[PDB]
Amino acid sequence: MNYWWVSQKQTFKQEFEGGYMWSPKENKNGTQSHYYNNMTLVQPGDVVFSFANGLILSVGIARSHAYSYNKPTEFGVAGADWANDGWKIDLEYHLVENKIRPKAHIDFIRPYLPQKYSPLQDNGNGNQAYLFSVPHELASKVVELIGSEAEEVIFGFADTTEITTTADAIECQISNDASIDETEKHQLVKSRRGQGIFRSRLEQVESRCRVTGVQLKNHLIASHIKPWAVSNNQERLDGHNGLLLAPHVDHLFDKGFISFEDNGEMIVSEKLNLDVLKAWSISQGNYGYFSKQQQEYMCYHRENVFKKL
DNA sequence: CACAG
Ligand SMILES: [Cl-]
Numbered sequence: 001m002n003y004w005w006v007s008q009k010q011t012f013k014q015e016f017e018g019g020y021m022w023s024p025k026e027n028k029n030g031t032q033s034h035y036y037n038n039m040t041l042v043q044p045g046d047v048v049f050s051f052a053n054g055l056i057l058s059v060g061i062a063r064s065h066a067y068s069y070n071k072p073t074e075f076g077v078a079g080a081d082w083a084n085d086g087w088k089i090d091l092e093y094h095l096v097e098n099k100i101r102p103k104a105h106i107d108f109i110r111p112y113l114p115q116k117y118s119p120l121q122d123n124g125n126g127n128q129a130y131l132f133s134v135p136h137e138l139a140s141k142v143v144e145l146i147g148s149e150a151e152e153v154i155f156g157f158a159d160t161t162e163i164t165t166t167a168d169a170i171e172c173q174i175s176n177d178a179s180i181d182e183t184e185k186h187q188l189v190k191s192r193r194g195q196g197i198f199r200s201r202l203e204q205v206e207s208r209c210r211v212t213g214v215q216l217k218n219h220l221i222a223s224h225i226k227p228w229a230v231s232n233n234q235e236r237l238d239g240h241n242g243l244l245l246a247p248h249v250d251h252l253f254d255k256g257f258i259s260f261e262d263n264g265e266m267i268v269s270e271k272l273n274l275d276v277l278k279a280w281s282i283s284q285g286n287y288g289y290f291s292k293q294q295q296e297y298m299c300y301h302r303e304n305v306f307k308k309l
Numbered sequence: 310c311a312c313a314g
Contacts, residue, residue, distance in 0.1 A: 010312040027310050035311080052312085082312090121313095128313045 001159050003134035004038070004048040004062075005119040006091075007126055012052035014074045021048070021091050022072055023130050024083040034117060038131040039066040039087035045161025047154055048091055049134065049142060051119065051126060055099040056146065059153040061161065064090040094153045100145045102126075108145070112138040148273075155271045155307065156255035167192065167229040184233065191236045194222030201239030205294075209246040210287040211266070221250035225297035227305060240293035248280055259306035262295045264288040269307040 008015050015021060023036045042048075042062045050058035069088035071079055102109060106124030112135065113120055119132040134142070143150040174180070174188045190196030199222040208215045223245050226235055235241050245253055252258045257272040264287040268277070277284070290298055 007312050009314090012312085015312095023312085029310075031310065033310070054313085078312090126313045128311050130312050 003139035005132040021089040202242040220244040256305040271307040
């Protein structure tokens with residue numbers, strides 16, 4: 001996942017109200033722009049800080065690649081000098097209550113500014129250009145200054161999108177793989193959604209939500225332990241590579257906010273706000289031993305899915 | 310160049 005800084009002093013209200021970013025493809029004289037070319041590098045799930053009137057106003061999530069699109073008519077005189085031939089990105093804005101003024105924090109962030117194409121000068125004044133790459137270390141400082149609301153956009157939210165993209169591509173690969181028969185293809189695709197033979201096989205091993213004890217089939221998700229995306233075709237259909245979980249517990253486990261020790265002890269991520277467990281009446285403690293086959297997968301989950309600092 | 314200053 002990549003971080004971006006979009007400078008929107010001229011058109012913030014229009015871009016926010018429309019849920020987009022927009023730049024020309026080229027400078028007015030037809031020359032290439034590093035900044036406009038950055039539009040073609042943004043991936044769905046990338047985090048974009050909106051900078052306008054000296055403040056960071058939004059921690060946004062990109063929801064498209066750049067697509068060819070005309071300059072928004074609603075820019076009017078404020079956009080007069082930009083070429084009509086442009087790039088648009090659908091940007092899911094998340095307004096923040098703590099609107100940080102980066103210039104007021106320049107001593108803190110200066111060491112983390114990139115050598116080339118920095119959104120800020122060393123005195124903390126913004127550079128006049130549209131879209132800048134933000135190194136991960138600079139992004140972590142900005143997130144520290146904004147506070148919880150910035151973390152809430154990223155962890156188990158923005159950073160899940162690239163995982164979904166990867167899984168979508170694998171589903172396409174399976175659908176086109178000549179080495180596997182039609183039934184296999186169907187069962188592998190259905191297992192991604194906790195359906196088909198995977199669910200029936202999991203029901204031979206597990207009978208209830210580990211955490212909430214609910215036994216009712218219509219209130220339980222068939223979750224993989226080792227994620228579907230990184231599982232081989234045998235592991236994708238293995239009844240021992242799963243848990244039946246209530247939907248909120250599936251959410252916490254699938255994203256790595258929680259995991260389990262082999263003896264069933266719940267492990268809570270530093271990235272899980274403990275107010276969530278209080279609000280949903282989920283206790284820390286022991287949720288029963290896992291089988292040796294389940295333990296192999298749960299080891300993968302602890303080492304690769306569980307969120308650690 | 311140039312969505313900040
Ligand atoms: Cl296009």
